[PDB]
mmCIF file of C-alpha atoms in Angstrom:
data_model
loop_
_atom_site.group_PDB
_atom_site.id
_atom_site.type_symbol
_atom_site.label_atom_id
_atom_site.label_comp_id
_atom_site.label_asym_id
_atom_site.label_seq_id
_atom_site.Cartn_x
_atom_site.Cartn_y
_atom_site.Cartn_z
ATOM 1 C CA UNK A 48 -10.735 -7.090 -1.581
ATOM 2 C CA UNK A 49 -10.027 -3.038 -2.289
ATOM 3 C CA UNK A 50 -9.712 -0.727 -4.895
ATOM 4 C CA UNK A 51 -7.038 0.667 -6.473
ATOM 5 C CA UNK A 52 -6.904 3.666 -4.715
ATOM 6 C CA UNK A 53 -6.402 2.110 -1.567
ATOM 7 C CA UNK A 54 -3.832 -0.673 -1.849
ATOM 8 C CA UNK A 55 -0.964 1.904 -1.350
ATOM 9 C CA UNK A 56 -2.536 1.579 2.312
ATOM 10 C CA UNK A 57 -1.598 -1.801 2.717
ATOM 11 C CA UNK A 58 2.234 -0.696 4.599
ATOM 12 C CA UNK A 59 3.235 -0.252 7.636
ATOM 13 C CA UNK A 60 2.477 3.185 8.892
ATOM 14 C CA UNK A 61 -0.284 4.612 6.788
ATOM 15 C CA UNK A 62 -3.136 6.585 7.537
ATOM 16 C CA UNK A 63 -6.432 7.182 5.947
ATOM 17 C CA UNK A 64 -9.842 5.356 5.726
ATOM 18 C CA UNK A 65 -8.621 1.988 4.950
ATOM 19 C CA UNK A 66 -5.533 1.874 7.437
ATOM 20 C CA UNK A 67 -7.356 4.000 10.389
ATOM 21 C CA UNK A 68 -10.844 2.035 10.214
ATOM 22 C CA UNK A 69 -11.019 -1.062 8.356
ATOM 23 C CA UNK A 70 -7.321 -2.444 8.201
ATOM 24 C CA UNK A 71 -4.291 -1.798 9.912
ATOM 25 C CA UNK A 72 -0.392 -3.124 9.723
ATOM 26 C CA UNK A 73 1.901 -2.454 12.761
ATOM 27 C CA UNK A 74 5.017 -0.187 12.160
ATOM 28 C CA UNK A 75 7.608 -3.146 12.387
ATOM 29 C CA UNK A 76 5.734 -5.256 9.660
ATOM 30 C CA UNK A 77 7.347 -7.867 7.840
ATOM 31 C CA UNK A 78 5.929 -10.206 5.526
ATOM 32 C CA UNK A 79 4.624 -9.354 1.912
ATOM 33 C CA UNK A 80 1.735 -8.112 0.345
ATOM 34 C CA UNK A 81 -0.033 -9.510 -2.661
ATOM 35 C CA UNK A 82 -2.287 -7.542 -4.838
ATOM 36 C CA UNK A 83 -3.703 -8.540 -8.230
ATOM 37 C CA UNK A 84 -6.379 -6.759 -10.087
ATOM 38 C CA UNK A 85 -9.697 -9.183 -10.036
ATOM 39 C CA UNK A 86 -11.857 -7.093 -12.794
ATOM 40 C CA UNK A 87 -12.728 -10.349 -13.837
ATOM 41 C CA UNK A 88 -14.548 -12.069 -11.278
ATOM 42 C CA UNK A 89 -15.441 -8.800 -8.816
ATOM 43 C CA UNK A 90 -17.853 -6.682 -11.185
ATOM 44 C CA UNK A 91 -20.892 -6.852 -12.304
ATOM 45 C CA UNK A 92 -22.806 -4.996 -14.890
ATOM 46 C CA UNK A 93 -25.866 -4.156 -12.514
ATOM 47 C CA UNK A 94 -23.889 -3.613 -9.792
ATOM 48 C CA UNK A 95 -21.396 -5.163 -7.511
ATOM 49 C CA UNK A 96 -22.969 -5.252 -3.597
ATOM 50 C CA UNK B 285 2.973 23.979 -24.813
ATOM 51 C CA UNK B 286 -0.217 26.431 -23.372
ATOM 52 C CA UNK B 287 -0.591 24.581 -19.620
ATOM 53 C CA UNK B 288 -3.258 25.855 -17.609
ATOM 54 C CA UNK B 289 -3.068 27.511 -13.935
ATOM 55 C CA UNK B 290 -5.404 27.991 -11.263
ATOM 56 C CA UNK B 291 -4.764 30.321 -8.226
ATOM 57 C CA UNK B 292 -6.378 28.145 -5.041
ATOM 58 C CA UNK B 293 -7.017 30.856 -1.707
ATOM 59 C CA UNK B 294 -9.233 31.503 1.227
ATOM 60 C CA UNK B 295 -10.718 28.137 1.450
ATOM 61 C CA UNK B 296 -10.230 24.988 3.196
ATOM 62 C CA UNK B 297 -8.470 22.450 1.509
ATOM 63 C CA UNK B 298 -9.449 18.450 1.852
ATOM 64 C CA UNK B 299 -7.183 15.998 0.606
ATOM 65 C CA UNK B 300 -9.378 12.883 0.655
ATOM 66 C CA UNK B 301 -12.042 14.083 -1.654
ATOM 67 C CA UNK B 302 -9.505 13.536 -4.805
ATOM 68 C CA UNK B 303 -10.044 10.242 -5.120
ATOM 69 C CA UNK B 304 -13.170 10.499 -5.560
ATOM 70 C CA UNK B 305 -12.576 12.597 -8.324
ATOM 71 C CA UNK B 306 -10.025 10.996 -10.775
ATOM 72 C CA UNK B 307 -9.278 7.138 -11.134
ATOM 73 C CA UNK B 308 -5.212 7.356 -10.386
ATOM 74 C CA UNK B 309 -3.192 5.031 -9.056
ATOM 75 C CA UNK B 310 -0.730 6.663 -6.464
ATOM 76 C CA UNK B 311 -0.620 10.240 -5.219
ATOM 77 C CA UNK B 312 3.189 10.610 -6.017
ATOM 78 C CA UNK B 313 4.498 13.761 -4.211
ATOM 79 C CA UNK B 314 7.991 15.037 -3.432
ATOM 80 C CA UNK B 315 8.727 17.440 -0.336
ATOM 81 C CA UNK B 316 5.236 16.524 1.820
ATOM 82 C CA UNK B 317 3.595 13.094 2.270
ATOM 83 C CA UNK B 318 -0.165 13.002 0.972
ATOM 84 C CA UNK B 319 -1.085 11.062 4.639
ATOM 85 C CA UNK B 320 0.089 14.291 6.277
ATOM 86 C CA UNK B 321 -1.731 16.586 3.839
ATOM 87 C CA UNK B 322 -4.963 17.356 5.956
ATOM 88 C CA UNK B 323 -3.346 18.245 8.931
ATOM 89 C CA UNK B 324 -0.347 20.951 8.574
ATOM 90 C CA UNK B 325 -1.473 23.722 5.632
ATOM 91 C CA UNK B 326 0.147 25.986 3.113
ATOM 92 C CA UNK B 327 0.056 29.574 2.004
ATOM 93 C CA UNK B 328 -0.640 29.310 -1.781
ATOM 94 C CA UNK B 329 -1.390 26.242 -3.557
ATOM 95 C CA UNK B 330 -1.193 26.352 -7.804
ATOM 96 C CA UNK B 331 -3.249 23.826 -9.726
ATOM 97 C CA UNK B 332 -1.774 23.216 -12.928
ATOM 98 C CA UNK B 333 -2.925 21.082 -15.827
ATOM 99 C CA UNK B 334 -1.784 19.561 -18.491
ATOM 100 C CA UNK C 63 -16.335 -2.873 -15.027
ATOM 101 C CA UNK C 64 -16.748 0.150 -17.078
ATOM 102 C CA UNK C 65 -14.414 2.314 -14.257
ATOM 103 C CA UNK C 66 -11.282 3.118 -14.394
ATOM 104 C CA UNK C 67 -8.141 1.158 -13.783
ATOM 105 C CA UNK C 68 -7.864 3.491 -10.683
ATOM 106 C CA UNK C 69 -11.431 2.003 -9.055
ATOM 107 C CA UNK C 70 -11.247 -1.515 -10.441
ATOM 108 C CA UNK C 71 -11.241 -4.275 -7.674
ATOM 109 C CA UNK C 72 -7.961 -5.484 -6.565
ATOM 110 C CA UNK C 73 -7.483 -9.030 -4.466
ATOM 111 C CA UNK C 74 -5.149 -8.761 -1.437
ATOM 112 C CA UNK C 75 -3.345 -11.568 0.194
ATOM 113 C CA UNK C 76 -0.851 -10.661 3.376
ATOM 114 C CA UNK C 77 1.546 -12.905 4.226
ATOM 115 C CA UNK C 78 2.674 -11.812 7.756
ATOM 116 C CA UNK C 79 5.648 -13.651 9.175
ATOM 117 C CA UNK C 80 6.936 -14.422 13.119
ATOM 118 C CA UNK C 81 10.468 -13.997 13.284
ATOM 119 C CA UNK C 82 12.392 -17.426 15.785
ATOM 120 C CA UNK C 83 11.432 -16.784 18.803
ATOM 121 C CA UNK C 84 9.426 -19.819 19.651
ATOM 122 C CA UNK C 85 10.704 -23.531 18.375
ATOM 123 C CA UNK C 86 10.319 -23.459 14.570
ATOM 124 C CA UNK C 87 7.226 -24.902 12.840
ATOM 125 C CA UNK C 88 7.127 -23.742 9.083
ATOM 126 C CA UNK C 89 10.390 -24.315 7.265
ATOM 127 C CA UNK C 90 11.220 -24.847 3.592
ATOM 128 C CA UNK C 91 12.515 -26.921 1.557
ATOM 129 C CA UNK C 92 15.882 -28.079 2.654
ATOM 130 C CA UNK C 93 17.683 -30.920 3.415
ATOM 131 C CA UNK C 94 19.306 -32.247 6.889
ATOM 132 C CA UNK C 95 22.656 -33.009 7.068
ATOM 133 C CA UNK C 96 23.893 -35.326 10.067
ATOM 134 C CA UNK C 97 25.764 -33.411 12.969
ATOM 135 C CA UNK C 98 29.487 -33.128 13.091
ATOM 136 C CA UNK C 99 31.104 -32.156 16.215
ATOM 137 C CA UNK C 100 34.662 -30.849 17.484
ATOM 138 C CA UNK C 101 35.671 -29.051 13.926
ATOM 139 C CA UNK C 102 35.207 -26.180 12.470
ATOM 140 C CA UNK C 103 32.452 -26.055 10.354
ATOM 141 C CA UNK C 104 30.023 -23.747 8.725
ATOM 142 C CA UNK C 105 26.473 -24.584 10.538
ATOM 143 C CA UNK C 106 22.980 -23.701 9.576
ATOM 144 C CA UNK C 107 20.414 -24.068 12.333
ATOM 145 C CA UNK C 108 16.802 -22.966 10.782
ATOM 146 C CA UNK C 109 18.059 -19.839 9.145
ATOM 147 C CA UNK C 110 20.986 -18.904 11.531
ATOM 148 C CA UNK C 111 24.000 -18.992 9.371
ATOM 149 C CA UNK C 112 27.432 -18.828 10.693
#
């Protein structure tokens, strides 16, 4: 699970916080990438944690 | 029809802090790529809003 | 879920495939066809076409 800000660094040779510490793709990726919004079930009023 | 601009100078300019800022999807640009922004710099930068 | 679009949670799913190197394990929905030798035919062995 991301945000939204971040998905566009989920590709093969990306850099930033997402693709440098917490997930990274090598540059001859292939396969596919799946993202759907989950507003639904991933918030909470109070506070998501 | 009355766009704004904004002169930008003598500063130091970080490129990660803007999404923080406003909820937007993709950071759509045309003759740099927005990884590369934080490492090579510019001369003058115009902020424009409309 | 008062943000905006931009910061709302998103589920990812990557499917990463391995091209045929190794004997072939995953394979879709096709069927077999018995093996016809000495004639020129058009043969498909798990995705190699020719």
């Amino acid at each position: 699970v991301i945000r939204g800000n971040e998905v566009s660094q989920i590709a093969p040779g990306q850099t930033g916080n997402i693709a440098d510490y917490n997930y990274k793709l090598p540059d001859d990726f292939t396969g596919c990438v799946i993202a759907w919004n989950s507003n639904k079930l991933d918030s909470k009023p109070s506070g998501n944690y | 029809y009355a766009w704004n601009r904004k002169r930008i100078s003598n500063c130091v300019a970080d490129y990660s802090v803007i999404y923080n800022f406003a909820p937007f999807f993709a950071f759509k640009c045309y003759g740099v790529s927005p990884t590369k922004l934080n490492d090579l710099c510019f001369t003058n930068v115009y902020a424009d809003s409309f | 879920p008062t943000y905006g679009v931009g910061h709302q949670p998103y589920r990812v799913v990557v499917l990463s495939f391995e091209l045929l190197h190794a004997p072939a394990t995953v394979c879709g929905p096709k069927k077999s066809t018995n093996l016809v030798k000495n004639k020129c035919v058009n043969f498909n062995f798990n995705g190699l076409t020719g």
